[PDB]
Scaffold this active site. Structure first.
Site, mmCIF file in Angstrom:
data_model
loop_
_atom_site.group_PDB
_atom_site.id
_atom_site.type_symbol
_atom_site.label_atom_id
_atom_site.label_comp_id
_atom_site.label_asym_id
_atom_site.label_seq_id
_atom_site.Cartn_x
_atom_site.Cartn_y
_atom_site.Cartn_z
ATOM 1 C CD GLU A 1 36.147 5.829 11.404
ATOM 2 O OE1 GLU A 1 36.705 4.987 12.137
ATOM 3 O OE2 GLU A 1 36.084 7.059 11.703
ATOM 4 N N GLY A 2 32.061 8.127 11.223
ATOM 5 C CA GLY A 2 31.480 9.396 10.929
ATOM 6 C C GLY A 2 32.629 10.266 10.485
ATOM 7 C CB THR A 3 32.412 13.893 9.767
ATOM 8 O OG1 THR A 3 31.034 13.611 9.391
ATOM 9 C CG2 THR A 3 33.093 14.848 8.785
ATOM 10 C CB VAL B 1 28.896 6.682 14.930
ATOM 11 C CG1 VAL B 1 27.555 6.759 15.628
ATOM 12 C CG2 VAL B 1 29.272 8.039 14.352
ATOM 13 C CG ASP C 1 23.507 6.346 6.069
ATOM 14 O OD1 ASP C 1 23.068 5.554 5.234
ATOM 15 O OD2 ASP C 1 24.719 6.549 6.265
ATOM 16 C CG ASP D 1 31.081 17.476 5.463
ATOM 17 O OD1 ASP D 1 31.103 17.465 4.194
ATOM 18 O OD2 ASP D 1 31.499 16.558 6.201
ATOM 19 C CE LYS E 1 29.875 13.585 5.430
ATOM 20 N NZ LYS E 1 31.376 13.475 5.299
ATOM 21 C CG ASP F 1 27.752 14.944 12.324
ATOM 22 O OD1 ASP F 1 27.380 14.584 13.494
ATOM 23 O OD2 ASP F 1 28.465 14.190 11.624
#
Ligand SMILES: CCn1cnc2c(Nc3cccc(Cl)c3)nc(N[C@@H]3CCCC[C@@H]3N)nc21
Length: 278
Positions: free
Chosen positions: A12-14, A18, A76, A117, A119, A135
């Protein structure tokens, strides 16, 4: 989707899931994001080109569902930070990562594109020492961790500025150095009061206009400010100076990405290699 193969879920992405995918005609390995006015403005983001921004390759609208095709990276910063928590990320690598992120933000801000956003999970890294922002521009074009949210957002300001991204990156910087999130709120008010307990409850002296913010309450806890040397030990005074500037309460006065790049903390910046285990 028959244009891809070995389509495999990363997570999960925002804005949706993905996947790692291989393109049919090219053999390219890409990141495919399936999202749960916006089309033109996301399409414009295909024009952003910077070494520290994850390239947006294609925008696909089909069956009323939106797919964004991005350049693929292997890890990431959240994963890398977790892997490095024993030992710590070395300062020269923290420095390099921060410098690069600032250059990405300087570029996007100079084109009037905000993130909103940031992070560790949207900061992607590769084996060569690069870090890239994923993003940008999606929050505005489209219209959950609070840990990186700027205080003007939490206080209900409706107008977002580029300062919100600087705040978030400051939080990330602190987390790379200490190994723990700086303001790990569990709710919007807990987020705000964790900020308040560390940086002091803002007032008119340090943030003109704060007490007229939408969600400001005159009954807000009046905490004293703590010293940076308590907040991000054992970071040196250059790093503490720069972080203080990135965490200024008044968004009009928080340091810009361009100005942060000139800070004395970066006089000895280099580009080390991370040892990534993939
Ligand atoms: C759309 C832009 N984009 C390009 N490459 C990625 C990418 N690569 C990746 C691959 C393996 C492990 C890890 Cl850690 C990350 N991962 C994400 N997002 C993930 C959502 C699930 C949790 C891990 C990542 N945050 N987006 C990518």
């Amino acid at each position: 989707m028959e244009n891809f193969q070995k389509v495999e879920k990363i997570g999960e992405g925002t804005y949706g899931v993905v996947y790692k995918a291989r393109n049919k005609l090219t053999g390219e390995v890409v990141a495919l994001k399936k999202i749960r006015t916006a089309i033109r403005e996301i399409s414009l983001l295909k024009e952003l080109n910077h070494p520290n921004i994850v390239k947006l390759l294609d925008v696909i609208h089909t069956e009323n569902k939106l797919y964004l095709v991005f350049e693929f990276l292997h890890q990431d910063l959240k994963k890398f930070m977790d892997a490095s928590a024993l030992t710590g990320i070395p300062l020269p690598l923290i420095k390099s990562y921060l410098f690069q992120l600032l250059q990405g933000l300087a570029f996007c801000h100079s084109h009037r594109v905000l993130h909103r956003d940031l992070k560790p999970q949207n900061l992607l890294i590769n084996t060569e020492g690069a870090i890239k922002l994923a993003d940008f521009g999606l929050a505005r074009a489209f219209g959950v961790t609070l840990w990186y949210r700027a205080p003007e957002i939490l206080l209900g300001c409706k107008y977002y500025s580029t300062a919100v991204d600087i705040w978030s990156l400051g939080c990330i910087f602190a987390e790379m150095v200490t190994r723990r999130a700086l303001f790990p709120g569990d709710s919007e008010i807990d987020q705000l009061f964790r900020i308040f307990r560390t940086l002091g409850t803002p007032d008119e002296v340090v943030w003109p206009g704060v007490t007229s913010m939408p969600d400001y309450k005159p009954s807000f806890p009046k905490w004293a400010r703590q010293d940076f040397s308590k907040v991000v030990p054992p970071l040196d005074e250059d790093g503490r100076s720069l972080l203080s500037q990135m965490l200024h309460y008044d968004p009009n006065k928080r340091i810009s990405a361009k100005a942060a790049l000139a800070h004395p903390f970066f006089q000895d910046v280099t580009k080390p290699v991370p040892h990534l285990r993939l």
